[PDB]
Assembly symmetry: C3
Homo-oligomer: 339 residues x 3
């Protein structure tokens, strides 16, 4: 909500309270788990008009879990999601630095549209596919003002030598290009980065370089939303072998995501989707599915501040998955107040 | 403070900064402890008018301790207190889900009125008596609009299998009924729930079911506040034996709380109170008091945003308490800015 | 930003998003380190007009790091910086209690003006020189209204027996006096406190009392900022021997800080500075420098909401420093949105 707008500065303080519960049998062997998943969000987005051509901006967003006790586990799953500041100049472009979405999410965003689940390959702290720390991102809209609908971006990812391989990365560069015309959109994005010493020390994955790319097609008009993503990764998708209790990265993955939605005027937005991510040449295993499901769901929008939803994942992962990926279904039910 | 109210949505951003210090001799053997207890609160409460009969709402509230260093202990005692969203329909009722007050607090709230202390049996993460995660709560005001002053509630508590017995619970159901008429109020509340495997594994407490109930009587008018609570619990009140360093739950407790306060027009609000909670059939011990004190205190309200207070607990727990419950007095002094 | 002002209460909700990166060779052997240092701040400052002479106030401020992953390390470096409430009466003075700046910072603030670095001796949780918990502070402006420009303060520091010696303190008292006249300012501040048993148990440092004092001179007018601080400490400055992996406090330090800055009308604010802190009579070592550098930097202010800066520390610590204090240079580059 815009709570301040004076002397060329405006501040949006936003957030949401999400009452959320997951239903799965037993849910350790399931897609999403079982039990209370309630959380809240808080953030600010500010923008200052420096002069007629130049705007400055900043954003911070935090996740507060609502499914922890007030005891020792109080902080589990709490984190800053975004924290960056930048400048945008006329049609020249924008530049921001901090914790922000990786540039391959410019493609993966096309299918990251489900009521609760979906967007499975947009891992956090995973090079260019999700939110990540220490990215400098340059974006250009409408090719310097010269070509309506043609956008591009480049992103410089600085090394993050963390205490876990899962959350680390080396230096890298990625980019994206998109074109939009009368409801349709097409996008491509690619990034490559060094892997850290700790990452190369892991049992699963082999190589000095992580690579991720994705393409997207969408139709987004007349209350209809259809989208598809195809992508591949090298030494970039995090995996765990639940049998050996061993972790690392998949040598290769092939990822497909499809989504179809409709927005009724009375507020209901049904969703159907399909997601499959398959790993290849995993040490000790070979080829193995990481994600494989159909989705059926719906959101009901009471208005722009209140909604409820149900999201059902019909899991197609089989019970003898060689990595021990959960095979059972999950249903989420949520009630959302947002501002 | 209401900081946004536009297009059928309003947002209250609220909080407080509480400078607070406890004085006890030595305070490990005392009621409240000794030293700095400063903290702050931040929260939002939003409400959207969906149509003339239906409102949506959401609330989140956090506790930031102000008595930690900026080093390793920075997060001690920090937590989300509340996080829920809901809908309220005409006189049909309200329904919310998330982290919220347990329904037996509908009774215990009557005496939870002291300047700093009091409300001793309203434990957090303790089935139905305090704030707890994963509760679906239905509330009805004035019996569907048909009976002025008659309210009721039912609450479904979902299992929380946590890493400690203290903070866990099984599935349960509780409810409350209250009636208010010309200053007087009467309330009753009861809940029962499964205990988790981890809870049943503890040395103290025996049984597959936790139960809590409480009754309340109050007079709240003409600047006078008088209230009484009586309740009992089974396998629900958390206890520790400081001698064996053993923990669990009391097989039975019998709880009484009394409070008397007056609000002077010039701002002073004196308080006197009495609290006793006695445990029964504790393994290895038998009968033992958990809480036993008289309180004298006062709050001075400068206005609705600024207050100060003093709260003195005259502890009646004896020095040879079989569980090692502290026997010394505590005085709290606080200065509160709130918005 | 002031987001509420009604019925004698006003609330400022403020914060910033700081995209920040440090460049050093290798940065473990450097002044500041290497890599992403992005963070955000959020706070409130409220003030209520109780009557014509009396105001109540409260403030809370938090640091959210933006350079952590969303995994296990999510909370590293997160903390409450400030949390206090108080009253201010006409010209009689102000009194606040909670987590606030130590009173010797009344002097050290003079030189704590650099774009990113500087203020090296204003350690957090270090008696009277930085932010600290459990301080009751009385401040007087213009000597009860009788002497324009003459201010003073006294501060009572309550014992904080923490789990680390570094973050602990005993009871203490400190104070400050300052005089300002036509651009010039002079200040002196001194505090002494008991050391806790845990502090006295450390290998480095010897004595039952910590002492800190500092003097300051400044000129702050006509777009010019010049300032100098001189101070000394006893058993108060925290130190680590990186060779023995041993920690404690310096028996004595002698500290000097100099700063010179200019604010151009077009927005640029160049900075030059010098800082030296030398420890004396360190057990096993003798005399040893803790800080020794020249600084050159600049901030560019686009307006009151957006800035960028560069801060270069030309480190003069030598490579064979007996405590293993880093000897390499560091450059910070930042982009700041604030509200
Ligand atoms: C105003 C704040 C701006 C701070 C900028 C921080 C610089 C971020 O460093 C990014 C380093 O990335 C360089 C990429 O180097 C290429 C590495 O090779 C891997 C690609 O295949
Ligand atoms: C276990 C119960 C949870 C199941 C949720 C059911 C969701 C109800 O919505 C029905 C799905 O409707 C499919 C329509 O898909 C929209 C596709 O639109 C494309 C039209 O061009
Ligand atoms: C819109 C979000 C709503 C999500 C609802 C979550 C469902 C919560 O589950 C509560 C389960 O409680 C059922 C009670 O079962 C009785 C157990 O027996 C113990 C009582 O003696
Ligand atoms: C160690 C010092 C701390 C003690 C705090 C003293 C509190 C001062 O207030 C006096 C208490 O006054 C008792 C009045 O109780 C109100 C009962 O009103 C019922 C009238 O119907
Ligand atoms: C309205 C809240 C106010 C609460 C006040 C808390 C009291 C803080 O305690 C401070 C104790 O400091 C006393 C100083 O004693 C001197 C110790 O000797 C060391 C100095 O050389
Ligand atoms: C590695 C590159 C980083 C270096 C940053 C360069 C900073 C540019 O500013 C130039 C410094 O100018 C010095 C002026 O100092 C101001 C003193 O004013 C006193 C006048 O009375
Ligand atoms: Mg989503
Ligand atoms: Mg209370
Ligand atoms: Mg600074």
């Amino acid at each position: 909500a815009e709570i301040y707008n004076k002397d060329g500065n405006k501040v949006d303080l936003y957030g949401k309270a999400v009452g959320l519960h997951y239903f799965s049998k037993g849910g350790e062997n399931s897609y999403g788990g079982n039990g209370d998943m309630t959380y809240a969000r808080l953030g600010f987005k500010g923008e200052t008009q420096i002069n007629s051509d130049l705007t400055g901006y900043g954003q911070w967003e935090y996740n507060f879990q609502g499914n922890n006790s007030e005891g020792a586990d109080a902080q589990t799953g709490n984190k800053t999601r975004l924290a960056f500041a930048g400048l945008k100049y006329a049609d020249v472009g924008s530049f921001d630095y901090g914790r922000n979405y990786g540039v391959v999410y410019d493609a993966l965003g096309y299918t990251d549209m489900l009521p609760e689940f979906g967007g499975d390959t947009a891992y956090s702290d995973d090079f260019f596919v999700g939110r990540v720390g220490g990215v400098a991102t340059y974006r250009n809209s409408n090719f310097f003002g010269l070509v309506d609908g043609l956008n591009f971006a480049v992103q410089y990812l600085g090394k993050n030598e963390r205490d876990t391989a899962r959350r680390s990365n080396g230096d890298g560069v990625g980019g994206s290009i998109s074109y939009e015309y009368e409801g349709f959109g097409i996008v491509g994005a690619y990034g490559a980065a060094d892997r850290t010493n700790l990452q190369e020390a892991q049992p699963l994955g082999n190589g000095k370089k992580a690579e991720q790319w994705a393409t997207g097609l969408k139709y987004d008009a007349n209350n209809i939303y259809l989208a598809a993503n195809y992508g591949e990764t090298r030494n970039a998708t995090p995996i765990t072998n639940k049998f050996t209790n061993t972790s690392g990265f998949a040598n290769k993955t092939q990822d497909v995501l499809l989504v179809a939605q409709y927005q009724f005027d009375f507020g209901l937005r049904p969703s159907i989707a399909y997601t499959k991510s398959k790993a290849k040449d995993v040490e000790g295993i070979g080829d193995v599915d990481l994600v494989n499901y159909f989705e059926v769901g719906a959101t009901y929008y009471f208005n722009k501040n209140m909604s409820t939803y149900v999201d059902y994942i019909i899991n197609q992962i089989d019970s003898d998955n060689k990595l021990g990926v959960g095979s059972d279904d999950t249903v989420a039910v949520g009630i959302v107040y947002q501002f």
